[PDB]
């Protein structure tokens, strides 16, 4: 029985940390290329 993530103030920024939206999108840093290269393929053919 969990009783947390409760805001006691009318201002939304007084709430606790937003710790329920873990999203991992590494492609914008790891594969930031136009031509999607398959793993099994030689990249520069």
């Amino acid at each position: 029985i969990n009783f947390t993530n409760i805001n006691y103030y009318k201002d939304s920024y007084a709430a606790s940390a937003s710790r329920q939206d873990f999203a991992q999108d590494p492609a914008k840093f790891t594969r930031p290329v136009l031509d999607a290269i398959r793993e099994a393929a030689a990249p520069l053919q």
């Binding site: 914008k28 840093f29 930031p32 136009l34 031509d35 290269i37 393929a41 990249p43 520069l44 053919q45």
Partner: protein, 249 residues
């Protein structure tokens, strides 16, 4: 499922042909876009001089030598006095634009070397100074180093990017290598990155454009000594608001 080595980049009346290209880095997977109505704050209608400013401007050619440290440009500053882009950048207070940075360095199959072409957002240039009082001039970089113009600026300490950050982690930025055995060009398409929808093209430089030789240019006697490095950049989706008298700096 592979990247074709041939590529043609047609923007405006400019066209760039490359036959040894690695790929095209789309910075952070985001194409340059015009400022949406939701993200805009300025009320004036922006000018979008599509083909007069969005085009490839070949700006600088730097001779790669064996002991060369590297060069860096600041994207708005490197075009602020060139073409119709510069005029719009001077006549308008506000500006936003992506770019298609295309670095060119061709060498024979008997040359070797590797450049690191990276586009660094908010490339704050550091000064290398001894322990001194905040009064000291050496603690802060002069304007020639913060805004090198179109000529660029030779790196003093490319190992720390002249920013106190290790060059080895500069690959966290949108980057591409020019490995002379592999490719002769590096293309980076960078969208407008800023905490603001528009910003002054004169005061604020959104991105740094570093070209650092990681593997030094080595060749044998008889090979062509002069191995140039050319920077051709093209604004993409350039907007300008706040028309007034043209301001240089």
């Amino acid at each position: 499922g592979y990247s074709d080595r041939v590529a043609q980049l047609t923007v405006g009346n400019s066209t760039i042909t490359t036959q040894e290209a690695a790929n095209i880095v789309l910075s952070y997977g985001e194409w340059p876009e015009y400022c949406p109505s939701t993200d805009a704050t300025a009320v004036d209608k922006p000018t979008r001089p599509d083909v007069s400013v969005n085009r490839f401007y070949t700006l600088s050619t730097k001779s790669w030598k064996t002991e060369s440290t590297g060069w860096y440009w600041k994207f708005p500053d490197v075009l602020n006095d060139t073409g119709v882009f510069g005029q719009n950048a001077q006549f308008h207070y506000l500006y936003r634009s992506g770019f298609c940075m295309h670095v060119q360095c061709n060498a024979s199959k008997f040359h070797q070397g590797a450049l690191l072409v990276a586009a660094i957002p908010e490339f704050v240039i550091a000064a290398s100074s001894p322990a001194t009082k905040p009064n000291s001039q050496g603690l802060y970089p002069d304007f020639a180093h913060t805004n090198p113009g179109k000529d660029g600026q030779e790196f003093r300490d490319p190992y720390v990017l002249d920013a106190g950050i290790p060059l080895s982690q500069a690959l966290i930025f949108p980057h591409q290598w020019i490995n002379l055995r592999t490719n002769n060009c590096a293309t980076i398409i960078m969208p407008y990155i800023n905490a603001l929808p528009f910003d002054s093209a004169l005061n604020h430089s959104n991105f740094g454009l570093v070209v650092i030789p990681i593997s030094p240019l080595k060749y044998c006697n008889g090979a062509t000594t002069e191995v140039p490095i050319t920077l051709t950049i093209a604004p993409l989706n350039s907007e300008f608001s706040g028309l007034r008298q043209a301001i240089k700096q």
